[PDB]
Amino acid sequence: VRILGYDPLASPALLQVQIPATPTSLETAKRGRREAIDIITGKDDRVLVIVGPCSIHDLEAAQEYALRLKKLSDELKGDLSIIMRAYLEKPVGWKGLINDPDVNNTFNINKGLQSARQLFVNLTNIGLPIGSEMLDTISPQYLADLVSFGAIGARTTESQLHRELASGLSFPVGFKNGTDGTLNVAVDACQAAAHSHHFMGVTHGVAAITTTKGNEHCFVILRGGKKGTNYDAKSVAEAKAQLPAGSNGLMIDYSHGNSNKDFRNQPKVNDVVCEQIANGENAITGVMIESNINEGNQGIPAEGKAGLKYGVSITDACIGWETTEDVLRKLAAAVRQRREVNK
């Protein structure tokens, strides 16, 4: 009585055929996973960097950005393992690329899944690994094969459904610290996801029973909270203090809460973080940066896509490309100096 109806949904298998992943895309995704694993587990001393737009609403602009990040990745491969941020939505307002690909308030999930997949293929096909946030348990079925890094939404860190999901993904997954500032829920999540799980889920577009093997590559993401920002050494210490033995490295988000809701502070956070890294801090193995071709953000005008400024986020504000180069080169320097403190 509360279900208006069901509209047809193309299965992942069908989508994978219409928008096939090139050998390069597959190899790229595989490579991104290996590198991320070695870093969060300490086998590698470079830093894992998830850099990119808060969200992608324009494939062309994303491709130009990707090409720039690719070039700069090759320049800093020795110190950084860069994965492009390819998030589809920011949890009223534009519901994201999957739900509203045309950015016109309509709903076209089938067209959305096609755009999202075309995007993922486009990016990985040039040798650039991507990372996306797992919003639900069904969409990953359509994109996972092209992902090298996944993050679980903060609102679902405590969800068994997402912990089960994580336990079955073929790549590292990050969980955010609780809203109260503590790391319990995230730690529990990582432990839960490490176990094998048995559950019902979509596969061919039908529901089946899944058995996962468990994911040992889950880590905590520091993202500020009710007790303030937590990227500083004091907070980092408190964070490591509550990480049971055998934990993976921590990943720090420069944006959102830790940036005090101001894209301009991301580089300031970079400074405080680079400082720790340069002085020998080995628990910080990753960072998250919201960057785009141009800085800041913009609202969606009455006209729609037609009135949007090119290369400017329509969700959270980002630092521009030039600033991103500065931030990343500085981070790379911090990593280099860190190898020395470890000599």
Judged by the rule CB under 8 A, the positions of this chain that interact with a second copy are 1-9, 11, 91, 99, 107, 109-110, 135-139, 153, 155-156, 158-163, 167-170, 178-180, 182, 185, 192, 195-196, 198-203, 205-215
How far is the CA of 174 from the CAs of 72, 95, 127, 177, 263, in angstroms? 25, 23, 23, 10, 22
Nearer to Mn ion, 192 or 314 (CB): 314
* Cβ burial, residue 73 (10 Å; 0-12/13-18/19+): buried
* Encoded tokens for 232: 């500083």
What minimum distance in Å lies between the beta carbon of 191 and a second copy? 8
Site string for Mn ion, 287-316 (x = CB under 5 A): -----------------------------x
Least CB distance from residue 155 to a second copy, whole Å?
A: 4
Q: Which partner, Mn ion, a second copy, none, binds residue 132 by CB below 5 to 8 Å per kind?
A: none
Closer of 112 and 311 to a second copy (Cβ): 112
Residue 316 contact, options a second copy, Mn ion, none, Cβ 5-8 Å cut-off depending on partner type: Mn ion
When asked if residue 222 is in the footprint of Mn ion (CB under 5 A), the reply is: no
What single letter denotes the amino acid at residue 305?
K
Q: What's the CA gap between 269 and 331, in Å, rounded? A: 11
Nearer to a second copy, 96 or 311 (CB): 96
How many residues bind Mn ion (CB under 5 A)? The answer is: 2
Query: 208 is in the binding site of which of a second copy, Mn ion, none (Cβ under 5 to 8 A by kind)?
Result: a second copy
Q: How far is the CB of 224 from a second copy (least distance, A)?
A: 16
Q: Please tell me whether residue 19 adopts helix, strand or coil conformation.
A: coil
Coil, strand or helix: which one is 17?
Answer: helix
Shortest CB 313 distance to a second copy, Å: 20
Q: Which stretch binds Mn ion (CB under 5 A): 53-61, 92-100, 164-172, 267-275?
A: 53-61
Residue placing its CB nearer to Mn ion in the complex, 103 or 335: 103
Chain-centroid distance of CA 219 in Å reads 13
Report d(CA 141, CA 170) in Å as an integer. Answer: 12
Which residue pairs from 106-114 have beta carbons closer than 8 angstroms and sit at least 24 positions apart in sequence? 109/9, 110/8, 110/9, 110/10, 113/10, 113/15, 113/139, 113/142, 114/15, 114/18, 114/19
In the complex, the residues that contact Mn ion under the rule CB under 5 A are 54, 316
